[PDB]
Design a protein around this nucleic acid. Structure first.
Lengths: 76, 141, 72, 129, 129, 246
RNA sequence: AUCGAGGACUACCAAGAUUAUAACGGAUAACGAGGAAUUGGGGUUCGACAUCGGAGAGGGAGCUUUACAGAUGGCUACCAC
RNA sequence: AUUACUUUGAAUAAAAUAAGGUGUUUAAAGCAAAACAUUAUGUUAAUGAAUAUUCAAGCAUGGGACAAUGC
RNA sequence: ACCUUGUUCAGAACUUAAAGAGAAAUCUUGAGUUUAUGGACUUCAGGGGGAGUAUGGUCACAAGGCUGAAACUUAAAGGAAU
């Protein structure tokens, strides 16, 4: 199922039987952090933690894959 | 080379003064940096009077914060008879690292060999090293 | 057809799977392969794989006894 | 007596060691005999296995050797001018290995660094820089 | 997630045989699953099978003939020494004349009666009555 | 213990003496000398049990101190002299010349000899070193430091010694065409032919010894003891001829 | 200094060493092993005590003799008899 | 390229366990003795269990399926 | 678009079983695939009381929360169904 919610969506692209950035897009985290004015929004203050926990997993992987520089760290 | 109170000279010093470098035993090629190098070390396995006796091990270099001496972490598995399953373990060994390996850094696999007690804990000596990846902090010997 | 060597276990282009896949496609130009099925069966206390290149819409070069046919 | 066992030291982890047995003669130590500068005086210490160590208490002369001229000649030591370990050895003129001593080149007619163990062998022997 | 593809396939085959189905389908097909079936085919427990390639570790269709009772995987593949065989046979198999173990040894994926003949041990994969 | 020990408990004695577990509390400790503690049979055990001449230790001291035993050419008067390998033992009074060889049962055996063949005894070189003043010498398995030797007498050969003279008669090299007797562990007391010696730089040297009957068994280089050259034995092998029956 | 490696000790310099894979500390009616009792398999409990290794001689300490003792059916002092 | 896994060994105190032999009147036991030469003689240079092991490490070797570590 | 019908994907549910499981009630999008016992991982329980009590630690302004025994006592306490 999904990474965080209990949804189970199976929609997928279907490559035929014939052979003839995402981390950047996940920084969404900026857009919510909107939070400066809606201080009482306890929902977006939770969905931000979910987004930030995703970033700490893509960074944790792009460093092992030696893609990102070893000094990378996401912050405001 | 000579940055200390006493004169730093090799254990086997002679005129032609020469540079002295024996070779250790079972097929460990002496590094180039110890042939043309001008360093002085009385505990280097190549250019001194420290042999390499029976036990020989290997491990991952972890700490390179002490002078000419490093810490080698050996990871193995221990078997428990009752559960018929293994468990991870580790033992740190403090080993001497001669200046013959200038490019040695934390996280590189190293083959070490036994010698006579060189300190309170140091009993092994580095023989050869193979480098590995980087972790944002290149800590050399 | 091309001529590439197979190493002894060199890159993925020098593996048996890739060479046979390349030979199959290059020897079959321009007709297209669109299916492969292997029908294992016990014969004389032995297993006999019978690879079948299906949907065709070799033994000398590669060595695979492969039957070629058309979809039902 | 002074002891040389490791049972009185802390572990590699900093943990204290809990004793099990009393002191033993195998790890026996002995008092230093700082061989100062003065008249000849050595003492024969009966070490382990009966062997005898000459313990030089005070010395004046040593058989210095010259590497260049391949000559070794006895000489009277004058003054300890440098010690690589403890500067207080210079003040008391204590003779230990590696001490830089100046000597008179009266038989050299034909600066020094000691290269022997006066507290073990029983006499001073060195060479010329 | 799918930790063990072999476990999923064997449990799919056992369920089909209980219902009396004529053939079964296994979505992810590996070399180990293909080689596990040959041990069951050589004993005539299953008729045959057909590895259909789908460019994505294609499926398998397995023909069953009323003979298999239960084929089960064993969780982490225990290292089985040759002296530990009859201990494992006495547990996982109904009788000394009926069952069949499967071991992945250095000589391929053998059963117990031919790994014993080949004089080798190895990790245990599973079993089938 | 504060020093060297003197007693030997019965159960701590080497197994290959076959001492009854209810015989007594202690076992005769073999004094030092040519042969090690576990490589030797004390002279008391040779006469009390192997030959049954003396029933107890009262009658063993009445014999050895009576100048009635000649270990090698010399004569020994120590009740617990270490009698080890093929070093010959002779009793002039009874006119018999034994010899202590091994056998397949991991036991020292007393092979009878004739008078002529008792005048010599084979030794195995242990090491060769250069003395001070360039006086080379070799050390045998008996602890003997022989004087100025042959230049080719290397570390692991076998020499022939004479009791009366003390010279070196014949010497056998260490190669792949020689007969060897075993002094080791599992292969102890077995005769065979050296066929292969595989070398590991680290710890040990492993030698594959092929038996007469085609049986092949390996061992450590230490336990190898060359007994002849070209499938020939220089001494009379024991009753079982160094053969092992599976 | 030692029979001898060694922070074993001294002088100078550096800040290092261990830890969730349990460091550091606490409990033991804890001397360790060969082994013993009971067991379908897996195991649980025990081992001062035959034999091997360690430690001690009322409690510490300090020493003499000799090849080996920090000896105690040797000595000195203190504590307790 | 190493490790892990598995197979053979090397090496490995005894007592103890399982165990081979042996009529202590049998048995526990012990590693003694006797079929026998009707025995000094010979069997006899008599037996001594290969005694198997023994877990966790350590050494070497045959194999690379299942696993682990980076290039 | 709203309604009627066929396929398919995802969600909250429902009905039948002569089958599977279980002590039974009952469960079936599992509480099935389990003495024919091993898919991966985490937490929790060991007769009933004493008791979420005493003490130690920590959090809170407070009420209180979290971690959490022992002495002693007793042959039952309890679950589903007739």
């Amino acid at each position: 199922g999904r990474m965080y919610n209990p949804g189970r969506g199976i929609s997928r692209r279907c490559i035929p039987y014939r052979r003839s950035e995402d981390l950047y897009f996940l920084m969404r985290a900026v857009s919510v952090r909107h939070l400066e004015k809606n201080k009482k929004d306890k929902d977006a203050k939770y969905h931000l933690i979910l987004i930030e926990s995703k970033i700490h997993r893509l960074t944790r992987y792009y460093k092992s894959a030696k893609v990102l520089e070893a000094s990378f760290k996401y912050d405001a | 080379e000579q940055t200390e109170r006493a004169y730093q000279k090799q254990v086997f010093h002679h005129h032609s003064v020469k540079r002295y470098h024996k070779q250790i035993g079972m097929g460990f090629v002496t590094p180039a940096e110890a042939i043309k190098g001008t360093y002085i070390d009385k505990k280097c396995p190549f250019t001194s009077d420290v042999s390499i006796r029976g036990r020989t091990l290997s491990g991952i270099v972890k700490s390179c914060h002490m002078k000419r001496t490093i810490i080698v972490r050996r990871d193995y598995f221990h078997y428990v008879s009752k559960y018929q399953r293994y468990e991870k373990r580790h033992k740190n060994i403090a080993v001497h690292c001669s200046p013959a390996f200038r490019q040695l850094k934390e996280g590189d696999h190293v083959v070490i060999g036994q010698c006579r007690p060189l300190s309170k804990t140091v009993r092994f000596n580095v023989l050869k090293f193979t480098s590995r990846g980087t972790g944002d902090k290149k800590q050399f010997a | 057809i091309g001529k590439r060597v197979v190493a002894h276990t060199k890159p993925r282009s020098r593996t048996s799977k890739a060479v046979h896949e390349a030979y199959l496609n290059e020897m079959l130009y321009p007709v297209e392969v669109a299916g492969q099925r292997v029908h294992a069966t016990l014969v004389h206390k032995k297993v006999a794989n019978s690879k079948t290149v299906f949907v065709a819409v070799y033994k000398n070069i590669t060595g695979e006894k492969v039957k070629f046919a058309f979809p039902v | 007596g002074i002891t040389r066992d490791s049972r009185h030291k802390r572990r590699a982890t900093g943990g204290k060691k809990n004793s099990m047995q009393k002191k033993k003669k195998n790890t026996m130590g002995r008092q230093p005999a700082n061989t100062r500068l003065g008249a000849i005086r050595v003492h024969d210490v009966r070490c382990r296995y009966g062997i005898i160590k000459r313990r030089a208490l005070r010395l004046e002369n040593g058989n210095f050797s010259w590497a260049s001229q391949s000559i070794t000649k006895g000489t009277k030591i004058l003054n300890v001018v440098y010690n690589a370990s403890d500067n207080d050895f210079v003040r008391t003129n204590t003779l230990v290995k590696g001490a830089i001593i100046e000597i008179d080149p009266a038989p050299f007619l034909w600066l020094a660094c000691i290269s022997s163990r006066p507290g073990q062998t029983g006499s001073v022997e060195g060479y010329i820089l | 997630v799918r930790v063990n593809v072999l476990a999923d396939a064997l449990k799919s085959i056992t369920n089909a045989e209980k219902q009396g189905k004529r053939q079964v389908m296994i979505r992810p097909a590996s070399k180990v699953i293909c080689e596990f079936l040959n041990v069951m085919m050589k004993h005539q427990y299953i008729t045959d099978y057909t590895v259909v390639d789908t460019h994505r570790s294609g499926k398998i269709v397995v023909n069953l003939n009323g003979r298999l009772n239960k084929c089960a995987v064993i969780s982490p593949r225990f290292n089985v020494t040759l002296s530990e065989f009859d201990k494992w046979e006495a547990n996982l198999l109904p009788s000394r004349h009926f069952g069949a173990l499967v071991l992945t040894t250095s000589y391929g994926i053998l059963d117990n009666t031919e790994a014993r003949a080949k004089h080798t041990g190895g990790r245990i994969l599973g079993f089938f009555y | 213990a504060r020093g060297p020990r003197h007693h030997l408990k019965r159960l701590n004695a080497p197994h290959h003496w076959m001492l009854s577990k209810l015989g007594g509390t202690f076992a005769p400790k073999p004094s030092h000398g040519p042969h090690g503690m576990k490589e030797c049979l004390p002279l008391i055990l040779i006469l009390r049990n192997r030959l049954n001449y003396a029933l107890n230790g009262r009658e063993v001291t009445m014999i050895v101190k009576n100048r009635t035993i000649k270990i090698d050419g010399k004569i020994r008067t120590d009740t617990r002299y270490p009698v080890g390998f093929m070093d010959v033992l002779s009793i002039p009074r009874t006119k018999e010349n034994f010899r202590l060889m091994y056998n397949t049962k991991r036991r020292f055996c007393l092979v009878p000899l004739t008078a002529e063949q008792a005048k010599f005894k084979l030794c195995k070189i242990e090491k060769r070193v250069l003395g001070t003043g360039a006086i080379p010498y070799i050390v045998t398995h008996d602890g003997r430091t022989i004087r100025y030797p042959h230049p080719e007498l290397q570390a692991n050969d076998t020499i022939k010694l004479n009791l009366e003279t003390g010279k070196i008669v014949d010497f056998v090299k260490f190669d792949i065409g020689n007969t060897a007797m075993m002094i080791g562990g599992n292969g102890m007391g077995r005769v065979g032919v050296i066929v292969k010696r595989e070398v590991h730089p680290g710890s040990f040297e492993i030698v594959h010894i092929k038996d007469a009957k085609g049986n092949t068994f390996t061992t450590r280089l230490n336990n190898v003891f060359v007994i002849g050259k070209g499938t020939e034995t220089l001494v009379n092998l024991p009753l079982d001829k160094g053969i092992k029956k599976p």
